[PDB]
A paper describes a structure:
[name] protects the cell from adverse conditions through the prevention of protein aggregation or by assisting the refolding of unfolded proteins and is an essential partner of the chaperone DnaK in bacterial DnaK–[name]–GrpE chaperone systems. [name], the bacterial homologue of Hsp40, stimulates ATP hydrolysis by DnaK (Hsp70) and thus mediates capture of substrate protein, but is also known to possess chaperone activity of its own. [name] [name] is a typical type II [name], i.e. it lacks the zinc-finger domains found in type I DnaJs such as that of E. coli.
Moreover, the J/GF regions of chains B and D showed poor electron density, also indicating flexibility. Since the J/GF domains visible in the [name]Δ108–114 crystal structure each assume a different orientation relative to their respective C-terminal domains, it seems likely that this flexibility is, at least to a large extent, concentrated at the junction between the J/GF domain and the C-terminal domain.
Author numbering:
A (entry chain A), B (entry chain B): 2 to 272
Write the structure that this text describes.
Amino acid sequence: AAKKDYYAILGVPRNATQEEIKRAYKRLARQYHPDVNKSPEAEEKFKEINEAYAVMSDPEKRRIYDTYGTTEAPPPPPPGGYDFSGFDVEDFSEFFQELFGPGLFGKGRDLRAELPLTLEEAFHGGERVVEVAGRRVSVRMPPGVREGSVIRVPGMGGQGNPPGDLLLVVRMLPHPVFRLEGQDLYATLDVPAPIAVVGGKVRAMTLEGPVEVAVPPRTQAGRKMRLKGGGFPGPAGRGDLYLEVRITIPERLTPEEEALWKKLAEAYYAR
Amino acid sequence: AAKKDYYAILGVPRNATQEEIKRAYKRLARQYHPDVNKSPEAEEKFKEINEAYAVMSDPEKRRIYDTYGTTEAPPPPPPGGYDFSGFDVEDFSEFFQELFGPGLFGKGRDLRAELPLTLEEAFHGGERVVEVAGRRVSVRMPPGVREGSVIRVPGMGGQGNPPGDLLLVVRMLPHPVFRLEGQDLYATLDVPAPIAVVGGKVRAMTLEGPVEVAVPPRTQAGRKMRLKGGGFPGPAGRGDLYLEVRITIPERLTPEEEALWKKLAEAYYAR
């Protein structure tokens, strides 16, 4: 209740410098430290010294204390609260609690947020700047990150003593062409009917870019083709790419091309 | 309330034999039977005879009727109760309800079972014979009956006064070709590539039978074609059939056919 004299406790004058306070703390802390001084009186003196230094080491906190009493009631807290890092704040005197209490909060809560990513964003990974309701955060993201993968950004959660963690959970945006299942990718490969019969090379697509795919002679619709290592990356191994063959036909032709298609069609009505 | 004379209703002497009661029932049952006698008076008379015979036919039940009213040893109804299977017990008089009431069981438990049906079986509906627990049961069935549909067969449940009900739930067996969704049907239509380009007729399938489906010129794979009313029937409406076009190519060809396919293929590598 009664205003503690932190200056008397550290044995420094009312107008001491910060370094004067620092060295006074060092001198007195080594004097009353639990494992150097095994006295019952030393426990309380050490506690006092730590409380004194906790307030006086910060110029901002030192000023609050200096201008307390003339203005009777405790002052409004700063945004966020008071930061007494490396100080057992719960063990300090009642005077302290009355004075700094309004801005002494408990363990900060974690914030859990979704990280909506496109197949190619998650595939590459790398550095992503994330703005999720509250703060701007940059994080490293492993190549081939999946749905429900947790990215912990420590200290970026809720405000408190200490602050909480940001927990980002990856969500996968549906893709126009590819379909993810585990580490494997699945896509439809359009193969022109003549190329399917004879067997040639079609231009297909991967997330890395476009590749050439050789289709064997007489490959039917629904034939699944594996491109080893063309799927999602992973720590222990890489997934594959599966292309499902989809026979395609020309929606437009030249009068010359009609003659060829007509002969085949007639041979089908024959069979 | 008053003691009914069952001997007077059946037309038998006070000390008749069990065979004499049986033949007197047959004589009077065929005289006042529902479908042979269309009289309003025959309704009560036939109910009277049914009440009499039910009591009189069983020697244990008949003795109970004979020894009722007198100031002798008062017998509580037997541990097993009274068996009146095949008689509208509640419909009977109160005199019957007072003497046999304590030995009667309540309405029987419902028997619950699954009715596994194929798409074609569910499509057509009608009369079905089913085995549940031990017995066979006939059951009418609406065309286009669906998954989870309840078919209450009254009086075909557990033993009781009256018996309970059979409750069947329709389960749909998976089909090799058709897929049900609501009342709509879905299936894959194989279409030879040359027919898809030029446009012609393909032999498609329904649950009724096979049909001809006219395919327009230049119809791409994935084109979905509605066959009105070709789906599942129902009250107030009929489902559609949807056939998804799947372009097919020949797995075997003639040396003459190779040349036609080879030309188009080389015109595609050129494109």
